[PDB]
Point group: C2
Chain length 85, copies 2
């Protein structure tokens, strides 16, 4: 149950990044898994949407094996979209 | 493309700028300026507005001629649920 949507976003992108850092060499295959993990820990206002949906979509588009950091740096500021639906 | 961080920053900036027009009477204009900020920055629920926690914080803290301190105190406060 997040108290603030922006804090939720910051938490979201940090946690996804760290999680994907655990999956080095296969990061692209774990973007969704790590996003779900981040949604549980950081919370969400709609669990279907999660803690930052635009970031998940960006990372799915961009993340390649052993290339995590550039993808995260590029995607972390993208608009999350509507947290409600 | 909406973003709640950008929305929050827009919200508090716009409320502050709006209240800067009402020097000496800021306390009476907090809600007005929050409506102005909500229209300008957008919201995910128009009744809730662009940052509800900030509105309530400013209602509590803003006194005549002390706007900047109030804004500084309130601008990082939790917005609450943007949806309802």
């Amino acid at each position: 149950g997040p108290a603030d949507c922006c804090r939720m976003k910051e938490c979201c992108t940090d946690r996804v990044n760290e999680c994907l850092q655990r999956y080095s060499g296969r990061e692209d295959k774990f973007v969704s898994f790590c996003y779900q993990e981040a949604t549980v820990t950081c919370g969400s206002f709609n669990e279907i949407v999660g803690c930052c949906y635009g970031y998940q979509m960006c990372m799915i588009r961009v993340v390649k094996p052993n290339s995590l950091s550039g993808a995260h740096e590029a995607c972390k500021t993208v608009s999350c979209g509507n947290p409600c639906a």
